Amino acid sequence: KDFIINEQIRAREVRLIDQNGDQLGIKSKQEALEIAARRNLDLVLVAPNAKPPVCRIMDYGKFRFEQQKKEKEARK
RNA sequence: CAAGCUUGAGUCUCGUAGAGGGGGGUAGAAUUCCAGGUGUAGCGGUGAAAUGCGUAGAGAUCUGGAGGAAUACCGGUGGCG
Numbered sequence: 001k002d003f004i005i006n007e008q009i010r011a012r013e014v015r016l017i018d019q020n021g022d023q024l025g026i027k028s029k030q031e032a033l034e035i036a037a038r039r040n041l042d043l044v045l046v047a048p049n050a051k052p053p054v055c056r057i058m059d060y061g062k063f064r065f066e067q068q069k070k071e072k073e074a075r076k
Numbered sequence: 077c078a079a080g081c082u083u084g085a086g087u088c089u090c091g092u093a094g095a096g097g098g099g100g101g102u103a104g105a106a107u108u109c110c111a112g113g114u115g116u117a118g119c120g121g122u123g124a125a126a127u128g129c130g131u132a133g134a135g136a137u138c139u140g141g142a143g144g145a146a147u148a149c150c151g152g153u154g155g156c157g
Contacts, residue, residue, distance in 0.1 A: 006117085019131090041131070052122050059131025061117050072127080 001067065005044045005060050006033065014045075014055040026052060 009029055012060070016024035016032050019041060036043040036057050043065075047054035 038134085039114095042117065051104075059133070061119085061129090062131035062133070064118095065128095065130050065134090066132095068128080 003044050003060070004043045004048075007045065009053075009055070011053045012034050014053045015050070017046075018057045027029070031041070034075060039071070056065050 011029055013026055013028055014032055016027045016035070018024055018035075019039070022037070032043050032055055039057060039059045042060040044056050044058055044060055046056045053060060
């Protein structure tokens with residue numbers, strides 16, 4: 001569920017996937033953070049144990065809200 | 077029982093203070109909501125949290141509008157009944 005995002009990420013390099021599924025390739029964490037920032041989105045570590053770790057560009061708050069919404073609705 | 081008397085009690089005149097009552101108008105602050113601009117990943121809450129809300133862009137900021145409810149300061153062993 002919970003993913004670490006943005007500056008919480010410690011990986012030197014990550015494989016980057018953008019908000020639409022475009023495979024941006026291997027990028028330094030710094031460049032990945034720049035791309036996320038220019039798009040006003042978050043850099044989310046979706047696959048911490050992949051080699052190299054996989055990050056997805058997305059709105060973390062919107063993603064998390066929808067996930068919690070889904071869980072709650074299906075149980076009431 | 078009858079006549080009175082004016083101090084009790086009323087009536088008259090002119091003023092005073094008051095959130096006293098009833099009706100009708102109207103005002104500026106705020107909350108919530110609606111519509112937009114800027115902005116971007118959090119907001120919110122607690123002892124700590126989680127539920128909740130936010131990338132269908134929240135919260136924060138600026139703008140316009142709707143609506144209801146109550147009237148900060150004045151304000152006080154102040155006032156009225």
